[PDB]
Amino acid sequence: MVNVTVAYQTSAEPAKVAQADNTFAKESGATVDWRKFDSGASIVRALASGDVQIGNLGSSPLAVAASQQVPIEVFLLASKLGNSEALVVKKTISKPEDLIGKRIAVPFISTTHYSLLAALKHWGIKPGQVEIVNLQPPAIIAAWQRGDIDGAYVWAPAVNALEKDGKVLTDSEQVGQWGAPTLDVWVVRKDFAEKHPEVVKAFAKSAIDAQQPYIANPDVWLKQPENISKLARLSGVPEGDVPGLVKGNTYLTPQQQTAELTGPVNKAIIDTAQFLKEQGKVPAVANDYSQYVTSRFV
């Protein structure tokens, strides 16, 4: 009897179909407690305490966790982030220079915190010129509704909630093109991987299998109504928003998973940590994070 707690986040992406179908529990035989978390930083804390054994992290919280020597490994990429993550602002903010003096919310050290800082640097705006405030996405939505912030760099469901009456100023496809790409990954605690390697393998299988039909033909995948409804439910977004969100990232074949986990993810962590250090968010970083990545479960 295996019990495993999986920390998940709200991105609308094809592997949510396997989550809704309970495929991981069915194939692994484990009792799975799927726990929704509002951002990666809170997942890092739950991984470090042992309350969570498998967790979905943005690349920015991943780099923070690895720089603190949390005993976790990336064993699977979830997505390469594009415009599914975006900076949405009040409609009177028309140009990046209009961000000066404004109150912009991001969840602390999320991929969108990282991308906001990378976007400001690319634009030549110092982060001290913007009032950057840290709120979790439910609080961001509530503060936006009451007019207490001028914008936020967010993912679903906050990104589409804000965009209904706001404007997109930049997004993570653009910030990636400017040289600061972000990723979503799955990580596992070493002690869990040591005791239940076949359960970890079954998690990776369930996620990879769910994404391949989308990769093969996005438009055919998106017209299967149960694919849309399952993502709408788990992400908390209207069905009409799901296709745009799903198309806002790219996903990996099994060959691409093995390729990325054998070098590129390490390099991504190295660079992400270095930028976070330069922005004053992490005190110490390493020049190699190979301890934090593995291909052995795919």
Residue numbers in the entry: 22 to 319
What does the paper say about this structure?
2-Aminoethylphosphonic acid (2-AEP) was selected as a structural analogue since it contains a phosphonate group instead of sulfonate. Although, 2-AEP has the same structural configuration as taurine, very weak binding could be measured, Kd of 649 µM, between TauA and 2-AEP. Despite the very low binding affinity between TauA and 2-AEP by ITC, a complex could be formed under crystallisation conditions. The 2-AEP is co-ordinated in a similar manner as taurine with an additional hydrogen bond between the phosphonate group and the side chain of Ser109. The crystal structure of TauA with 2-AEP suggests that although the phosphonate group has the same tetrahedral coordination as sulfonate, it cannot be effectively co-ordinated in the binding site and that the ethylamine group alone is not sufficient to co-ordinate tight binding of 2-AEP to taurine. The internuclear distance for the sulfate and phosphate anions has been determined to be 0.38 nm for S-O and 0.36 nm for P-O suggesting that the smaller 2-AEP phosphonate ionic radius results in weaker interactions with the binding site of TauA. Despite the high structural similarity between taurine and 2-AEP, the later also displaces 10 water molecules.
In E. coli, the ssuABC and tauABC gene products encode for an ABC transporter for the uptake of alkanesulfonates and taurine, respectively; TauA is the SBP that recognizes and binds taurine, TauBC is the ABC transporter that mediates the transport of taurine in an ATP-dependent manner. TauA is composed of two α/β-domains (domain I (23–104 and 202–319) and domain II (105–201)) connected by two-loop hinge regions (103–106 and 200–202) with the substrate-binding site located at the interface of the two domains; both domains are composed of five β-strands flanked by 11 and 4 α-helices, respectively. Although, SBPs are usually described as highly specific for their substrate, we show that TauA is capable of binding different taurine analogues and alkanesulfonates, including phosphonate analogues, with different affinities.
